[PDB]
Amino acid sequence: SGEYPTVSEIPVGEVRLYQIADGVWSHIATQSFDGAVYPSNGLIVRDGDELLLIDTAWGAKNTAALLAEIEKQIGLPVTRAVSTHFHDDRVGGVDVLRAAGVATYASPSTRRLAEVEGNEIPTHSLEGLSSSGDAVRFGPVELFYPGAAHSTDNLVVYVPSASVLYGGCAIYELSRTSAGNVADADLAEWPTSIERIQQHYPEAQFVIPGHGLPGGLDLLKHTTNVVKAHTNRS
Numbered sequence: 001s002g003e004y005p006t007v008s009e010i011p012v013g014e015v016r017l018y019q020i021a022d023g024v025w026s027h028i029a030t031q032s033f034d035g036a037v038y039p040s041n042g043l044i045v046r047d048g049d050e051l052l053l054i055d056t057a058w059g060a061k062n063t064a065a066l067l068a069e070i071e072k073q074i075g076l077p078v079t080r081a082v083s084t085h086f087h088d089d090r091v092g093g094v095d096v097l098r099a100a101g102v103a104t105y106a107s108p109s110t111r112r113l114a115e116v117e118g119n120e121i122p123t124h125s126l127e128g129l130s131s132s133g134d135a136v137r138f139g140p141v142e143l144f145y146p147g148a149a150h151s152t153d154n155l156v157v158y159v160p161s162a163s164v165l166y167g168g169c170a171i172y173e174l175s176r177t178s179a180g181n182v183a184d185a186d187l188a189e190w191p192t193s194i195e196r197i198q199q200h201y202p203e204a205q206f207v208i209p210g211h212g213l214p215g216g217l218d219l220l221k222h223t224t225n226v227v228k229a230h231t232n233r234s
């Protein structure tokens with residue numbers, strides 16, 4: 001499209017799509033959290049005559065709105081979804097996807113952490129991702145576990161046909177110059193995990209953060225700078 005949508009343009013309950021490349025879209029929703037309102041991104045990837053979804057739209061109502069906007073703008077069925085960590089902006093709405101016939105997936109690490117926290121639990125388990133540096137194919141994407149960062153279970157997703165790297169909540173947009181929610185983070189390991197991403201995907205052309213505006217590979221160095229400033233807080 002043209003301009004990327006912002007919190008001021010999406011009332012809570014609605015969802016926007018944004019085309020990144022041929023067969024690749026982000027989805028954008030908003031939610032209230034501890035008095036503020038935040039935007040949040042996921043991904044959609046064309047999979048033959050079907051669609052692969054990356055992450056929910058942060059809640060049941062938003063995720064029903066996401067399915068309806070996919071039918072309006074694309075018109076192909078969502079058959080599988082992957083959640084990239086255990087927080088509610090990634091798994092909240094999994095029950096809506098399941099009731100609609102979507103097969104929901106996450107690593108065994110994510111499924112366990114979601115159950116402890118009381119969040120919705122994806123049905124299927126992704127094997128082969130428990131060690132830092134592990135990668136597996138999942139149809140038109142590669143899934144990568146870079147090590148602990150924003151959370152101990154965070155995954156990143158690469159679309160090779162389009163050179164699109166989806167960083168999720170391990171990667172910060174440029175406008176964010178201070179750290180956000182770090183309660184579940186590994187601050188000591190986060191920079192090393194970002195370096196694994198840079199070394200595995202040096203050809204990436206578009207980088208999509210979990211919250212806010214897309215950019216390029218500069219977002220990886222940016223995130224390192226912000227994490228190290230938080231580590232050195234007074």
Ligand SMILES: C[C@H](CS)C(=O)N[C@@H](Cc1c[nH]c2ccccc12)C(=O)O
Pocket residue numbers: 033038039087088089169176179180181182211212
């Ligand atoms: C609910 C999500 C689950 S990831 C969370 O708890 N925190 C997020 C959201 C966030 C915090 N500050 C911001 C400042 C600007 C934009 C987004 C944010 C994070 O830390 O990136």
Ligand SMILES: [Zn+2]
Pocket residue numbers: 085087150151169
């Ligand atoms: Zn999170």
Ligand SMILES: [Zn+2]
Pocket residue numbers: 087089169210211
């Ligand atoms: Zn998030």
Ligand SMILES: [Zn+2]
Pocket residue numbers: 174221222223225
């Ligand atoms: Zn920066």
